[PDB]
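Complex record, two chains
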Amino acid sequence: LKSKIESILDCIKNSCIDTLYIENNILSEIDPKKNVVYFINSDLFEVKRINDKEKVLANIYKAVSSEGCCIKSIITDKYVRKSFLIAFGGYRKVE
RNA sequence: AUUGAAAGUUCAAAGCUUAGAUACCCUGGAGGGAAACCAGACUUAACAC
C-alpha cells in the first residue's frame, strides 16, 4: 500500500502531465509571513495493518494528546511535546 | 410769345362666411435569480505518580 501511494504521488510529481498550465501567469506566489498553505510530503506515509478499527480510532487520542501515553513514550521534556503538537496537531489552547 | 391756360383718379367699401387635428393603432417581442462555497477546527487543565 505504501508503495502504491508513493507510486500515485510520484506519478503526478514529475512523470505526469507537466508544467504545461503552471506556465500561465494567473497564479500568485504566496507571501511567506502572511500566508499559510499545505502540501503533501511523499516521505511521511507510514502504513500499518489495523486488525481493529474502533480501538485504532480510540488510540489516535494517545497519539495526538499532550498527555497521551504514546507521545509521552515517544517524546520527553514535554516542551517540544507541546511544541510538536502545536506545530502538528492544529490549534491548541495555550495561555 | 407753345393745338395753349386751368382740373388731386377722388368718394363709399371689415378678406369675410361655413368648417371638431380627426380617423385606424395592445409597450410588445426575445431573455433560467442564477454562479461559487467542507457544519467544520481542536482537545486542554488540575493534582497524584
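Note: The radius of gyration of chain A is 19 Å.
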